[PDB]
Amino acid sequence: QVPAELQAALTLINNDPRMRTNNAWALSADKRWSLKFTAELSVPCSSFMPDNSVWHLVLWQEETLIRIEVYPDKSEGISATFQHQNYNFSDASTREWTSGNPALENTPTVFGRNLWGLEPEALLDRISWRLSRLLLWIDAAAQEKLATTGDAVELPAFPDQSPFTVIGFSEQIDDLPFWASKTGEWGFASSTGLPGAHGTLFLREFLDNKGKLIRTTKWSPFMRKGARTTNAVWSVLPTLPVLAPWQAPRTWQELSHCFAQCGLSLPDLFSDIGRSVRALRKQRAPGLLLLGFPLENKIGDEPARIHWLALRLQPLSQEPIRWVRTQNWAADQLRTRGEAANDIRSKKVLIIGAGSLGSMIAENLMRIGVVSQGILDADLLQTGNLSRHALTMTSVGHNKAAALVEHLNRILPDASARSFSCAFPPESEVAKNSLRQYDVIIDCTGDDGVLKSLAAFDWKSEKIFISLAMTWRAEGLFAFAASETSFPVTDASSRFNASASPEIDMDEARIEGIGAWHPVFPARADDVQLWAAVGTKFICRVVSAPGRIYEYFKQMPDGTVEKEPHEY
Amino acid sequence: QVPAELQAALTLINNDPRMRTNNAWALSADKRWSLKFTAELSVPCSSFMPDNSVWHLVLWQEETLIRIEVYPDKSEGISATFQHQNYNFSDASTREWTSGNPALENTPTVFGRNLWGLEPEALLDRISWRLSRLLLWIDAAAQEKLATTGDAVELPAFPDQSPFTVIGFSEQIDDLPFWASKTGEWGFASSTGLPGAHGTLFLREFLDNKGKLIRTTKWSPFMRKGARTTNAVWSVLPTLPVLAPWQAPRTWQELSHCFAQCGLSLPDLFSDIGRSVRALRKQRAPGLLLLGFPLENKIGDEPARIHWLALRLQPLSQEPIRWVRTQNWAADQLRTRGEAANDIRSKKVLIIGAGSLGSMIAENLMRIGVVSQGILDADLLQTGNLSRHALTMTSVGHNKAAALVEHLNRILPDASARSFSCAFPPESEVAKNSLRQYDVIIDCTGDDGVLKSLAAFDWKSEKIFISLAMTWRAEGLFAFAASETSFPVTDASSRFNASASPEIDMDEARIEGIGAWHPVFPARADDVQLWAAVGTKFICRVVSAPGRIYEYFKQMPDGTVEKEPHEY
Amino acid sequence: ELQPQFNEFLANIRPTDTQKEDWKSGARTLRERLKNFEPLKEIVVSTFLQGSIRRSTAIRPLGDKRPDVDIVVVTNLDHTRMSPTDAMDLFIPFLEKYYPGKWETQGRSFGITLSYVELDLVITAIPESGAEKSHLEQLYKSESVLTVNSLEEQTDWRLNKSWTPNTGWLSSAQVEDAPASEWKAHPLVLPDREKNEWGRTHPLAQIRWTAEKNRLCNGHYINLVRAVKWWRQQNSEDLPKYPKGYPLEHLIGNALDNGTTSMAQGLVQLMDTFLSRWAAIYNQKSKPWLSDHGVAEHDVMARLTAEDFCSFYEGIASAAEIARNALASEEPQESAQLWRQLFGSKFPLPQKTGRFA
């Protein structure tokens, strides 16, 4: 029997002035309840959308969530794909509806803020909400006002895109003129697979018709070490290849139609590619096709960057086109979820001590934007240190600095880290000159000899010195910062001694292991991570406003952190 | 010319009643100043140490540090190696002193606390300190009282030990009886190399004379997947093979002498090994020799564990023996630098959500002792997420849970983590039964549907539920905890709404990238790490004292953390 | 007859959801903990929820007062040998272990303080022997007895050991009640106020009768009981201390007639029938005699004084006058105000935070 909620929904549809329905509810084999209903328009109709449009309301349940979706009718429904909507494709199945469900949840500019409101929880209220949003969406689509000034330019939905394979590239603003004069030209391109990843590739270099380098892409040292295979063909187009109104071409014929609309010819391009492949004996066969076009970030703005789309590579066939997802791995497109200020992201940073605190600080700095880092250490990594450290068992037996540098270079595609295996101060003059090229010097060793050697070293220019250290049992943190040609050691030592810190007791000091004599200082991983985060924030604040700064931090049993500053 | 400081040192040596000197200072080619001087004893002399012992005071400088060391004379100096001293070996060189420098810095029990004091900074004061400590050390060595009750049993110094190769093993207290009845028996053993590490091996299984398994060592899933090669021979000995007083055998003859003192015969063992190798066609040749012995942790206590030493594998030769360092990787010997309480280290923990906060919390928990963990997630990792996450680019394109589980299993040799690729709640009943085997359930998803599904799930027993979430711009943290059969969702939602939290503004919400529509929530890596550490501490405190607990945390611009609790 | 306003009033006088999840989860957790306790593993047979919470006849306490939740633990002890004090003393270690500093013994019961509700548990025993005890225990271990949902939620609930909760995707066979030959003549024994002797109780028949009466009255009996209780709360100054609780519900149930169409009509009929039936008792200055649903040899109004009944009768007469004039009034606002005169202000007149991880 038809349940009461569906009867109430039927009454709701019947009552609405701009909606009519005659068919009743029907349960499917997949436990989906569907109802056929017609909708009207209050705005002059367009060619793409008729006035009386037939839709199907479908409700189902997956695990504990109830899905409410309106799908176009296969016979008397809309056939084109608009913005904020999935691809409207009709398949050969018992389904009476298509797959072009409008994305009602998205709120365009035309959608009023008060009209949008919020989504209810009860099924009937949710149904009413969805139906009102559907009416708004259909009138907006009729007006061709779904995308207006100020909205983001979302890419059209592509049919049958593999959810595993990804292609990466790097295009910046300054690269726009270089391609601007090459509209209508085609060439070859090479790619490399990401080591250890699953189904990911990235572009490396661009060639021309006869196979000559025109541009090379800069990557991280981890990515730069790889085999380059030329298996792509690139061609620059005037605009985005999209069919009216926002439909992505599904067959080769539609792509050729869009090419003809732009003013180019796909078969001529294919013939030229074949001829050039015959000419060059080294070239075997391209496997991918790349289409480049200028793209904007908002509607009403002007293009500033080139976007590339990839398809698995004839023009006259009706076969479906295989599409592959592409991502821009440019520096400004990597940390859109939060990044540090430009004042610290443009500095070269040197860190002395690749132990517990230093490794975590370096990892955080690499993840927040600072990419030019150097590490100074001359010790070896052991299994015990991994109790409080940022590396794993695959780095045991290596120099700490080198392993940390490799790990940092494996983080993001714009990393550039260097390692020094010597101990401060270096003996060779060349190493001293290399060290004197950094702007910020950070000390995370906890050793007084390093502090004296820093004061005994000739830096030949003004530098920013930061010293960070923890107390006994990791109950507190000393942070000191200065901006001078030479490091002040007496003032730092006086500030360290003046602060109230716990006394060292040998009872809590456990021996490193059986058959050993020297003890170790007690510290858990969470305390070190806490202090590393606090120190990173301190470094950012110091770089923003340089000067003579000293601060002491103390952790409390309830989980709070208190701060004692010093007035100069 | 002899500088003034050295003349003052000469006067100091001459003035001391228990010290005499006639030779003056001498500068060497390696820029080392040396002086020959004799020392006396106030205690009856022993056979190993004479009363009038000749030493050489040597001073040099490496980079910015001045090294002060006293070395025994090659002709009329001490020849045996005691405790708190390097190996006394005389080489064929122009050096007039040996390499058996006493470790004066170490403080034995005989060394008075007031007498030890502290080390000065001036060269002359440091010289006086070193000489007084040398006198104390020599009289203590004469009395054979260097090691007394309460001191740690430090292993003797081994000549020519490679500083790169390491052998790992796992021996616990409960394994002591099993070897106790096998004193005087020998057999074969197999080892495996650590993947990605440099010069590290670890033992896997133990066999007998005819090649039958007697014991297998349990490791992490990462370590368990490896090739086992039988290339070692083991033999159990009654005591530690050390020569009087604390000298490690350097040649094979000394090792045979120690074996004879124990009551065994090295040549017989070698002949038996050769005969058995001939008998078994599969065996090619052992390459290492392992010696096992009961060992104590403090002098005066009784043995509780078996320690193994390794040497590169004749008994009558005078050739030097090659030694290899060994480490015990038992669970109680891995986190001697700080660990969590036993109440949380014995619990099975399930975490829902392998995103930003969950991965960091899981890593911290694995590093602090909690080894039985399960991860529930069904999403894929992308390049952008690495801005705030615990993994790298080598995990892109994988399921989040599986990659996190692999990373956790690569941390310490006692890890045991499982992964579930389904989404809560699971469909299969077997998965539900597997999930119902955990004690602590942690939610780090930030989704309300998960909270409702948790309340809709039948756990069939009392569980500890923890929910952790961050606020807009990562300015605050909600922590909720309860101990019930079912998860209270209404109370948690009321507590979340009652707390003062920042309002969501779309201005700060940046778009995920070009060609996209949905925005992302702003959060930097350091904030997430801070909140992860705070949440780990909160979890530990909750496990210690279960109950209905809610807390809200807020970060301040100065770098402090404030807490608002709720009274029930 | 101003039905939506009455529905809003009923929604306003019902207990909140936070308390609801609190009592449900607390009952389940207590059951699990009692089952897992080794010293009382064999002793404890069942633990089930009773009272106004189970019968959906409870109102929201004014202020921050915690609602009272009634639970019963059925054991297998022999009351002919053990005193009530010993049986109640057997449970002290369990409370000291699982509920430290939150439990208090008073009268015949134990009281536990939760976050939002207060539990009241009573230790009971089975007075039968042999196969009868086995059948009774099998009934007491059924899903019909071990359900935490109120009568309002489960409109298909029946007192049968072969009954299962009927759940549908949006909205099978309706098993009927068990014959009275299996449960009616078998009560339970419970301690008295002074814990000196064992008396008789039988709550399952009370729940079954409440469900049947609500079914025959088209789901209006419980709401009318709630409304009368709220009216008693509002006019407390002019009303006596007793009756209150179960005796008041028994009086309401006796007064009502099968076939209630709407709330106002039911209220008027209730008050008129109450006035008609007990007029002779009122003019003689006495009290009525009503038999309990479970035990037929007991009087519910046994501790009620005659003067209390007389005062309650006078108050009911005044309320009946007000309701009679309210129902006839055709103006909606005037009728609503007339209803608000008795029920009070709660009678009407015609946010999710952002969490990221």
Place this chain on the structure above:
Amino acid sequence: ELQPQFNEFLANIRPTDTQKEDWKSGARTLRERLKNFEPLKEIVVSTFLQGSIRRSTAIRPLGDKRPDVDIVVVTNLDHTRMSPTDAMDLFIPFLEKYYPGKWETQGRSFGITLSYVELDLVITAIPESGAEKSHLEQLYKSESVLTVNSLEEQTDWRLNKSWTPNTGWLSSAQVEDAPASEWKAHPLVLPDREKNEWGRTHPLAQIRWTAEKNRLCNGHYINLVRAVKWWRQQNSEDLPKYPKGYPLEHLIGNALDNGTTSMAQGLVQLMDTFLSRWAAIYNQKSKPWLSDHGVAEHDVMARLTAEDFCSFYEGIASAAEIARNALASEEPQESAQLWRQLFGSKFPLPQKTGRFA
């Protein structure tokens, strides 16, 4: 002659180490910043340290007062055309940029406030032209002039452009001073108090003469100057406001004789010679005339009144009596107390924290 107690007193009256590193680092940083500034790149020729700090004749200020550190910036401007005010005004943007809210102009100088010390800088110019200016600039850019170490640390320091700091592993050729024909007859021009005219100064000869006098007196001249300054500080009530500073040091240097063996003998000889030389001037109520080491046409005691000199003479006579009776005394404690009468309480009578990473 109680030498160790005098050494302890000298150690107690010297400036602390924190201040020392402060002034050294500040001078170096200021030099680098001045060099890197584009608007004054060609104008600035040199920046060097002078005063009592360079000559090792400074004492510790009582309280938390910041010591005064004197610096000189030598430029290539022409004083015949530019007024002093313009030259001093050319440096305002640099101070506003690098030292915001920490600089103040007073008299002829600029004062900068650091963490522990206070810098006092004066703008000077070279009055020569041609190859003479080139030679002078080459001398002013040498390591002898651009050193931040005091005279006490560098006992081998000489005024020569071919001089290098001699550093040994524990303890080569000793270059001597330059001939007077190259530096003596070439002074510098500096602003006056009112910044209305340029006067003449020559500090390098002052430093050289101080070094030579200390060398001939076996390293006792500077310590005696410090002791006399401390004595002036202690007996401030019975002493006039002037002389103080460089004029007092000049008087001390004139009074002393070459070949000082010990501190007490030197003090007694100093006071006796001072009394002997200026007795005739004292009884005539006048002041002495002393020529500056650099400029021979200037009088150091030009702003000193006669009454100030008379009062200073009387105080010196009393101190000479005390010192004379102190030196003869053979009892160590009595002699130490006699010395403590003048110098004060500071004359004696016969921790590293744990940091982990």
